Amino acid sequence: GIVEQCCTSICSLYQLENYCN
Amino acid sequence: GIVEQCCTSICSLYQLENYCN
Amino acid sequence: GIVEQCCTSICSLYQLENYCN
Amino acid sequence: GIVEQCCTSICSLYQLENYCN
Amino acid sequence: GIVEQCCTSICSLYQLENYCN
Amino acid sequence: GIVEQCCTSICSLYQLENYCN
Amino acid sequence: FVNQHLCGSHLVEALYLVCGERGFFYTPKT
Amino acid sequence: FVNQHLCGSHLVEALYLVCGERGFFYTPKT
Amino acid sequence: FVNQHLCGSHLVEALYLVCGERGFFYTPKT
Amino acid sequence: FVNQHLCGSHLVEALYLVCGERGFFYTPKT
Amino acid sequence: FVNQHLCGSHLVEALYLVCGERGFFYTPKT
Amino acid sequence: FVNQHLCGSHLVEALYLVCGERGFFYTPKT
Ligand SMILES: [Sr+2]
Ligand SMILES: [Sr+2]
């Protein structure tokens, strides 16, 4: 999930937009 | 909603717990 | 102290109230 | 400048990217 | 006190050092 | 650089003033 | 616990503290 | 430029920046 | 839900949230 | 991405997120 | 060092930076 | 009192506190 994508691994601000409502 | 209430007025940690998953 | 309780170990928001004046 | 604009008005992440090295 | 002064007026890092243990 | 000085190692607030404009 | 005056990122910080591992939804009016 | 690690409150602060008024969900259990 | 680790500024931010106007002490040497 | 109302340390946080490893310059009017 | 306009959690952050391991007391008026 | 580790956004938050209106540069590649 987001923790694996962005914290454990790294992610772009574009990837973060995946979790916008 | 909560976002508006905490900023314009005031809110409790207990009201915030309602937005937990 | 608080570092051992809440950082090294974990603590609840209720435990954190122990350090209020 | 940007510092003033984001605070008084509004700014985009794209405008901020201009201040990157 | 300091909490009020920094918010309503302005304060220095040197004034803050007074609240250190 | 600043990461080595202040993050990897430790630095004082006086050292941080080295990076002011 | 005390009552809270919370705007912008300060609200999200509070949600994060209150909910922790549970997660939360952040839903502002449009 | 290789990307950055975003954890805990920093991750939620970033969601807030990127999403703003659209709002977001923070679901670490997912 | 198991609890969360609070360190450094995050810990002080949490004290502020929980304590507010009552105020608090942050004494890591203790 | 959405538009942003950002004052004080909140701007520096946003710069930090947007630029990451690139770094950035923070240059307020005097 | 420069002078500071600091409200809410922003003050506690500043105290935390200035004092570090020493700790500090946060004591608002009631 | 031995000093503290400042990383990532915390480091930039500290630069902002110390430098304020003078502004600063955050250049981690350097
Ligand atoms: Sr703020
Ligand atoms: Sr952190």
Asked if residue D15 lies in contact with residue J8, where contact means CB atoms within 8 angstroms, the answer is no
From the CB coordinates, do chains L and A have 3 or more pairs under 8 Å?
A: no
Task: Return d(Cα H30, Cα I2) in angstroms, integer.
Answer: 15
CA dihedral I5, I9, I13, I16 (to 10 degrees): 110
Q: How many C-beta neighbours within 10 Å does residue J16 have?
A: 26
Task: Return d(Cα J22, Cα J16) in angstroms, integer.
Answer: 9
Determine the residue of chain H that is closest to L29 in CA distance. Answer: H1
Type and span of the H or E element at K24: strand K24-26
Asked if residue F14 lies in contact with residue K1, where contact means CB atoms within 8 angstroms, the answer is no
- Does residue K1 sit in helix, strand or coil? coil
Residues of chain G that touch chain K, judged by Cβ-Cβ distance less than 8 Å: 5, 10, 13
Which-ligand-closest: CA of L11? 2
Experimental structure resolution, Å:
1.9
Residues 6+ apart with CB under 8 A from E4: K28, K29
- Does residue A17 sit in helix, strand or coil? helix
Interface size E-K, in CB pairs within 8 Å, comes to 61
Task: Return d(Cα L11, Cα J12) in angstroms, integer.
Answer: 10
Do residue K12 and residue I12 have CB atoms under 8 angstroms apart?
yes
Bridge partners of F11, per DSSP, are: L4
Tokens of E4: 């009020």
Task: Return d(Cα L30, Cα L28) in angstroms, integer.
Answer: 5
Residues of chain C that touch chain I, judged by Cβ-Cβ distance less than 8 Å: 1-3, 6-7, 10-13, 16-17, 19-21
CA H7, chain centre distance (Å): 8
CA I14, chain centre distance (Å): 4
Bridge partners of L30, per DSSP, are: none
- State whether the Cα torsion D10-D11-D12-D13 is positive or negative: negative
> DSSP class of residue L20?
G
Query: What was the structure determination method?
Result: X-ray
- Does residue H23 sit in helix, strand or coil? coil
Task: Work out the minimum CA distance from G29 to partner chain J, whole angstroms.
Answer: 15
CA distances from K19 to F12, F18, H13, H15, L29 (A): 11, 20, 25, 30, 29
Name which of L16, I28, K20 is nearest F12 in CA terms. K20
CA distances from H11 to D15, G6, L16 (A): 22, 19, 21
User: What does B1-21 look like in DSSP terms, one character per residue?
Assistant: -HHHHHHHT-EEHHHHGGGB-
Tokens of L4: 């503290």
- Chain L residues inside the 8 Å CB shell of I8: 4, 10
Q: How many C-beta neighbours within 10 Å does residue A14 have?
A: 9
Residue D6 exposed, middle or buried by CB count within 10 Å (0-12, 13-18, 19+): buried
Interface size H-I, in CB pairs within 8 Å, comes to 4
Residues found in chain I: 30
* Amino acid in the structure at residue H14: A
> DSSP class of residue A6?
I
Name which of J30, L13, I9, G16 is nearest B19 in CA terms. G16
Asked if residue H13 lies in contact with residue A13, where contact means CB atoms within 8 angstroms, the answer is no
CA dihedral I8, L19, J9, D11 (to 10 degrees): -150
Residues 6+ apart with CB under 8 A from K5: E6, E7, E10, J8
Task: Return d(Cα K5, Cα K3) in angstroms, integer.
Answer: 7
Bridge partners of H25, per DSSP, are: G25
Q: Is L23 left (phi over 0), alpha (psi -120 to 50) or beta?
A: left
Task: Return d(Cα A8, Cα A18) in angstroms, integer.
Answer: 17
- Chain J residues inside the 8 Å CB shell of D5: none
Q: How far is the CA of J14 from the centre of ligand 1 (A)?
A: 12
Residues 6+ apart with CB under 8 A from C8: none
